[PDB]
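G., before I forget:
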Amino acid sequence: AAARGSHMSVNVIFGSDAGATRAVASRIAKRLQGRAVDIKSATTTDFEACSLLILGAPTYGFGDLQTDWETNIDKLTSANLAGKKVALFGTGDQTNYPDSFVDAMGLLYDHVVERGADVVGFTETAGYDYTASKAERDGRFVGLALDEDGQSSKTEKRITEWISRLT
Amino acid sequence: AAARGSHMSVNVIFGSDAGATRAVASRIAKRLQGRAVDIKSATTTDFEACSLLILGAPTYDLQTDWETNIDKLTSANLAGKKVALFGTGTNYFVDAMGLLYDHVVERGADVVGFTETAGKADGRFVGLALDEDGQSSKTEKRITEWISRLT
Ligand SMILES: Cc1cc2nc3c(=O)[nH]c(=O)nc-3n(C[C@H](O)[C@H](O)[C@H](O)COP(=O)(O)O)c2cc1C
Ligand SMILES: Cc1cc2nc3c(=O)[nH]c(=O)nc-3n(C[C@H](O)[C@H](O)[C@H](O)COP(=O)(O)O)c2cc1C
C-alpha cells in the first residue's frame, strides 16, 4: 500500500534537463502540499486526478519545448482538462535568450486552453527584461516566469506571491 | 485548495441499496485510510487514481447501480493495477463479487485479497465475503484478516 504522496489535491508536473525546474517544482509542491511529478514518469491520471494542476517546463533549443515534454506531450493532449483549474510556471534565461524567453510556457498554455482548462495565475512582466516571449498575453505572462540562471534570488519571492493568488 | 480525502492511495468504490455495503465500505476505508465512493457518484478517475482499488457490491445478481454505471469500470485503465474485492450478501452467496471479479480480470487488474471459504465468486474466495445479515460479529474479524492479506 502506497501513500497518495501529498495531502492536498495538487499535482505539479514538470520537465527538467539540468535540475533547475525539478527543484522549483518541488518548492512549489511543498507550499501547496502537492506532488511533484516528472513528465517522464507522469500518467494521464496525474493530469486529471487533481483539483489544481500546475505544469512546469524549461525552454530549450530555439524557444522550443523541453525534450521530455515534446515526447510525452500526448499525456497532456489525451487528458480531460475541461473546466479544470490549471496554472503554469516556466524556467528560462532572459539574458542569454531575450527573444525566446520562457517560450515553452506559452507552448504549454496553448495546449491546455485548447483542451478547455481554466488557466489561472497570470503574472506581470514588470521585473523582467526581454524582447519576445510566447508566454506573454495582453502584456502579461500566462504564469510564473522564473530565471534561476540570473535571477535566482527573486524566484523565492515570486513563488510566494504567485501561489497566494492560486488559493 | 481541496484535500485528496485520504492519506493512503486507496479508493473503495461501493454500491448499496439498503445501506449494508455502504457501512462496510466506510469501515474498510477508515481502517485502510482510504476514500469511500458510491458508484453512482464515482468517476473513472476514482477507479484509476489509486495504487489499490477496492470494489464492493451487494448481491440482489449485480446491484442495479453497478450495472447502470458499469461504463466507469469498462472505461477505466486497470491494466496491471492492484484490485481487491469485498462482497455483501442464510436466506440465499456474494454472487455479484464474482461478476465484479470477472470484470476487473478482463480489464487486466491484478486481483489480490483472495479469502478462504472456511467461514459464482479455484476453491478459494476471490475477495472478502461478508454476511452482515447473520454474521456481523465476524465481519470485523474477516475485515481484519483481509486487510492483513492486502498489506
Ligand atoms: C541549449 C539551451 C537553450 C536554451 N534556450 C532557452 C530559450 O529559448 N529561452 C529561455 O528562456 N531559456 C533558455 N535556456 C535556459 C534554460 O531554460 C534554463 O537554464 C532553465 O533553468 C533550465 O532548466 P532545467 O535546468 O530544469 O533543465 C536554454 C538553455 C540551453 C542550455
Ligand atoms: C431481491 C434480493 C436478492 C438477493 N440475492 C442475493 C443473492 O443472490 N446472494 C446473496 O448472498 N445475497 C442476496 N441478497 C441479500 C443482500 O445482498 C444483502 O441483504 C446485502 O447485505 C444487501 O446490501 P445493501 O443493503 O448494502 O444493498 C438479496 C437481497 C434481495 C433483496
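Chain A has one domain: 10-162. Residues 10-162 of chain A form a domain with the Rossmann fold fold (CATH 3.40.50.360).

More on Monday.
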